Amino acid sequence: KVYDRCELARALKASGMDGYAGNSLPNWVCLSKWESSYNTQATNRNTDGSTDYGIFQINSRYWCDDGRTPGAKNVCGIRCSQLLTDDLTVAIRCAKRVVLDPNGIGAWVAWRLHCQNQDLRSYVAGCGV
Numbered sequence: 001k002v003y004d005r006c007e008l009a010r011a012l013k014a015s016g017m018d019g020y021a022g023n024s025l026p027n028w029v030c031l032s033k034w035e036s037s038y039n040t041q042a043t044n045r046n047t048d049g050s051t052d053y054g055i056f057q058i059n060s061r062y063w064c065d066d067g068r069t070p071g072a073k074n075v076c077g078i079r080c081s082q083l084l085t086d087d088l089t090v091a092i093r094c095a096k097r098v099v100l101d102p103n104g105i106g107a108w109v110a111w112r113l114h115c116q117n118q119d120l121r122s123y124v125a126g127c128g129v
């Protein structure tokens, strides 16, 4: 599914992402936009044999099993395929796990690049949340 910006903002807010591990909602909408353009079906293969999956582009080297990644740890304990559904439940539960590591939201390259230190007001403007 390709989510609408406010539609995504509502589903994240409803799922307890606003303030999760100290990351306000606009952080999460900004990284989703830059990482996947809001598409739950987005996939991107890396040089290292790993692949990024879903709206949050979670990486297969550490977080999910895609059965073709060398040295994979599957910390979320899931199949990467579960990260591509229109339903965000599993993706959200795994992104919540990812942010608890030491690097926090800095785990996401797109956040570091386009959201960190930025004015993110625009990502939730007009959503009424």
Ligand SMILES: CC(=O)N[C@@H]1[C@@H](O)[C@H](O[C@@H]2O[C@H](CO)[C@@H](O[C@@H]3O[C@H](CO)[C@@H](O)[C@H](O)[C@H]3NC(C)=O)[C@H](O)[C@H]2NC(C)=O)[C@@H](CO)O[C@@H]1O
Pocket: 046, 052, 056, 057, 058, 059, 060, 061, 062, 063, 098, 101, 102, 103, 107, 108, 109, 110
């Ligand atoms: C920039 C790139 O070529 N790939 C982007 C990629 O880095 C992103 O996946 C990020 O990969 C890094 C590197 O493997 C992951 O960070 C590691 O996470 C472990 C779990 O917390 C730590 O123990 C390691 O210390 C740490 N390595 C480093 C060197 O910081 C990061 O977890 C990961 N992120 C996600 C999200 O799955 C993905 C997403 O930005 O896309 C690109 O491939």
